[PDB]
Write a protein that binds this ligand. Structure first.
Ligand SMILES: C[C@]1(C(=O)O)[C@@H]2CC[C@@H](O2)[C@@]1(C)C(=O)O
Ligand SMILES: [Mn+2]
Ligand SMILES: [Mn+2]
Length: 315
């Protein structure tokens, strides 16, 4: 083994640079190093609140990315366009890191590595795909079994259970993978209090955060996905008012331009997997927020080449 090695058992910036190159070249991180990253990141995530609360000073910025779905070469493109993560270039990845794309292992270990390196500036929120039933079907479990072992997969599953479910910036912008709730009256404190270290239930606030979608018409509808609901602009308005928020950013749906702003400004979708599954032909985007101006600034990007491995090859 002549690949990336942790230094004194810990992630460093040089390790991360070596790792990204190793992965670009289609090589595998030694199982012992992967294991160390997973055990250490479990510890880090398990100490976090279900609702991560982050203050952005006036001179600070943050980048918000939506679904990446194992599109590792596109993840590298994000970092090339927007800079590597650091204490002055923080990131939030809003769920759905794995499944569908066939470089899910490379995406997730790169994301976990950066979480370890910059724990206060590199944020990961759970998506509906960071779950066992989804991973069993949509590629990630197959990919981990192919590259490592079932035991390694079990560890990933345990780590995913500790991913926080939402993040609030400056008490003004709430970020979650899916969206808002099937019942009125949910508060930020209710979210804080969710016991998240589990597979999601098929109903209730944890399910909704990971699974719901906005709809343009007022009200709520039964979801076509078979779980959670669609929520209209009236739902969003009431939730923002009760919680003293400005707007929400969510992900969870492909958008041709990589983003959408619904509910009159109140419900933003960001989606960061361009040409999704090598077929959708969509642009992707990421968002910049600034401490002095939390209105979203969209930055679009398009797919880059990757090795010839088909989406879902491991599913
Ligand atoms: C189909 C998708 C998936 O994750 O299964 C994939 C494509 C759009 C979005 O990401 C999706 C609907 C989601 O679950 O977030
Ligand atoms: Mn998704
Ligand atoms: Mn999703």
């Amino acid at each position: 083994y002549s690949g990336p090695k942790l230094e004194d058992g810990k992630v460093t910036i040089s390790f991360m640079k070596e790792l990204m190159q190793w992965y670009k070249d289609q090589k595998k991180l030694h199982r012992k190093c992967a294991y160390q990253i997973l055990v250490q990141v479990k510890e880090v995530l398990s100490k976090l609140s279900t609702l991560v609360e982050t203050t952005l000073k006036e001179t600070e910025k943050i980048t918000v990315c939506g679904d990446t779905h194992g599109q590792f070469y596109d993840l590298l493109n994000i970092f090339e366009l927007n800079g590597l993560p650091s204490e002055t270039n923080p990131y939030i990845f809003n769920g759905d890191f794995v499944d569908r794309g066939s470089f899910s292992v490379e995406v997730i270990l790169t994301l976990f590595g950066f979480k370890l390196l910059y724990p206060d500036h590199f944020h990961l929120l759970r998506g509906n795909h960071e779950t066992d039933n989804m991973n069993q079907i949509y590629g990630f479990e197959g990919e981990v079994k192919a590259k490592y072992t079932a035991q390694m997969y079990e560890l990933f599953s345990e780590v995913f259970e500790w991913l926080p479910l939402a993040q609030c910036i400056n008490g003004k912008v709430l970020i979650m993978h899916g969206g808002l709730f099937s019942e009125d009256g949910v508060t930020l404190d209710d979210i804080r209090k969710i016991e998240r270290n589990r597979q999601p239930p098929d109903s209730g606030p944890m399910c909704d955060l990971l699974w719901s979608d906005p709809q343009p018409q007022n009200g709520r509808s039964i979801s076509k996905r078979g779980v959670s609901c669609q929520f209209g602009p009236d739902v969003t308005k009431a939730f923002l008012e009760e919680n003293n928020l400005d707007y929400i950013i969510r992900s969870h749906e492909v958008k041709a331009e990589g983003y959408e702003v619904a509910h009159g400004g109140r419900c933003v979708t960001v989606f960061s997997a361009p040409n999704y599954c090598d077929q959708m032909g969509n642009k992707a985007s990421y968002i910049h927020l600034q401490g002095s101006d939390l209105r979203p600034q969209f930055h679009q990007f398009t797919a880059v080449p990757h090795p010839n491995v088909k989406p879902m090859a491991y599913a």
